[PDB]
Design an enzyme around this catalytic site. Sequence first.
Site, short mmCIF file in Angstrom:
data_model
loop_
_atom_site.label_atom_id
_atom_site.label_comp_id
_atom_site.label_asym_id
_atom_site.label_seq_id
_atom_site.Cartn_x
_atom_site.Cartn_y
_atom_site.Cartn_z
N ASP A 116 22.89 23.64 13.25
CA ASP A 116 22.10 23.32 14.42
C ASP A 116 22.73 23.65 15.77
O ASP A 116 23.56 22.91 16.28
CB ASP A 116 21.71 21.83 14.34
N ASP A 134 17.86 26.68 20.10
CA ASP A 134 17.95 25.66 19.07
C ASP A 134 17.46 26.07 17.68
O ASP A 134 16.26 26.17 17.44
CB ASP A 134 17.18 24.43 19.58
O1 LIG Z 1 17.60 15.91 19.74
C1 LIG Z 1 18.49 16.74 19.63
C2 LIG Z 1 19.55 16.74 20.72
C3 LIG Z 1 19.36 16.71 22.11
C4 LIG Z 1 18.10 17.05 22.91
C5 LIG Z 1 17.54 18.36 22.44
C6 LIG Z 1 16.25 18.38 21.92
C7 LIG Z 1 15.74 19.59 21.44
C8 LIG Z 1 16.54 20.74 21.47
C9 LIG Z 1 17.84 20.71 21.97
C10 LIG Z 1 18.34 19.51 22.46
N1 LIG Z 1 20.63 16.59 22.59
C11 LIG Z 1 20.87 16.32 23.91
C12 LIG Z 1 21.80 17.07 24.66
C13 LIG Z 1 22.09 16.83 26.00
C14 LIG Z 1 21.41 15.82 26.68
C15 LIG Z 1 20.46 15.05 26.00
C16 LIG Z 1 20.22 15.30 24.64
C17 LIG Z 1 21.53 16.25 21.64
C18 LIG Z 1 22.91 16.00 21.63
C19 LIG Z 1 23.57 15.78 20.41
C20 LIG Z 1 22.87 15.83 19.20
C21 LIG Z 1 21.50 16.11 19.20
C22 LIG Z 1 20.84 16.33 20.42
N2 LIG Z 1 18.47 17.61 18.59
C23 LIG Z 1 17.43 17.53 17.55
C24 LIG Z 1 16.72 18.88 17.42
N3 LIG Z 1 17.67 19.96 17.30
C25 LIG Z 1 18.76 19.99 18.26
C26 LIG Z 1 19.49 18.65 18.36
#
Ligand SMILES: O=C(c1c(Cc2ccccc2)n(-c2ccccc2)c2ccccc12)N1CCNCC1
Length: 337
Positions: free
Chosen positions: A223, A35
């Site tokens: 991102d 990420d």
């Molecule tokens: O909250 C999210 C995101 C997360 C959960 C996550 C948390 C930390 C790192 C990776 C994934 N996911 C997510 C993906 C699959 C299941 C549940 C959540 C997103 C899906 C679409 C858009 C955003 C996010 N993000 C904010 C921080 N950067 C990455 C995107």
Amino acid sequence: GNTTSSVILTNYMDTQYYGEIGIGTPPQTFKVVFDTGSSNVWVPSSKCSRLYTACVYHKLFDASDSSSYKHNGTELTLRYSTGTVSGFLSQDIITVGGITVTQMFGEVTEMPALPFMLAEFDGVVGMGFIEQAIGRVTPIFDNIISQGVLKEDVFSFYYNRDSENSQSLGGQIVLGGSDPQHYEGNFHYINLIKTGVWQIQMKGVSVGSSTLLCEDGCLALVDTGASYISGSTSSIEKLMEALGAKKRLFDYVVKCNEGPTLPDISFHLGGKEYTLTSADYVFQESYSSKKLCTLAIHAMDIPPPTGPTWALGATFIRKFYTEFDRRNNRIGFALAR
Ligand SMILES: O=C(c1c(Cc2ccccc2)n(-c2ccccc2)c2ccccc12)N1CCNCC1
Ligand SMILES: *[C@@H]1O[C@H](CO)[C@@H](O)[C@H](O)[C@H]1NC(C)=O
């Protein structure tokens, strides 16, 4: 140095891209998202209460089984757009694509069912800068660079379009370079607005011919941890009005038959136009006039200081192979293949 390290990624439903890392001695393996939108490493802990259903359904790190584990215990809370995790800091050896590094990471003890019961991955490897690291913990790529082994101070992302097919390659991260097998033409670079965040200036967002949005400029966070392309609630409602899309609970939808008729969406970055056709942003699961098809674009209000900002996630990366250049604080794009 003289080395390049690649991490093979699994593509789950074009929404989640993750690879494996090893933590401890002997290695405890975890599925992790790489990420660029965050700077911390974390995995679920064996100390996580089993009343958190997400901790019952994910791999847990057990410090008691690692001979290289070093206690810290400093509490930390990691807040994301989708949710929050809480835990404490620990140190151990982490293995990533053949590279071994001593890393401070989070042992998560509080992991909410929403959204974590939906994650196919266990944790996250933050590919962002130290400036955004919670508890100012040195990010993993900074620790790897200190070893003086990588050929270049860069890392690259390839996200495949194909998830259903076996023998396809879900995706790939190259630490220390790029893979020319996965891009064509030349890289086009856009400088970071500032160091500390993988964010660039965007000069316009066009729906079809006219520039409907981001007139006078706006921000774009590149991102790798985001599934979709996102904009502010105000930007997306205007975008969706133009597309004729209907708002549901969390996403936007179109009648499946109308999906192919949708206009191109263009993102103006560093003087070049980055175009996505409807095939690139519509989850075309059918062609029925009686079914609703989801769009791989939604609203996400990212708060200051990072936001308000658009986020260019997996939807964008699938079309455009991305190089993250730490040496020159810039992002490079090339047509993926
Ligand atoms: O909250 C999210 C995101 C997360 C959960 C996550 C948390 C930390 C790192 C990776 C994934 N996911 C997510 C993906 C699959 C299941 C549940 C959540 C997103 C899906 C679409 C858009 C955003 C996010 N993000 C904010 C921080 N950067 C990455 C995107
Ligand atoms: C945890 O590590 C950090 C290094 O960032 C240090 O400041 C802190 O004192 C450590 N805490 C303990 C309890 O060892």
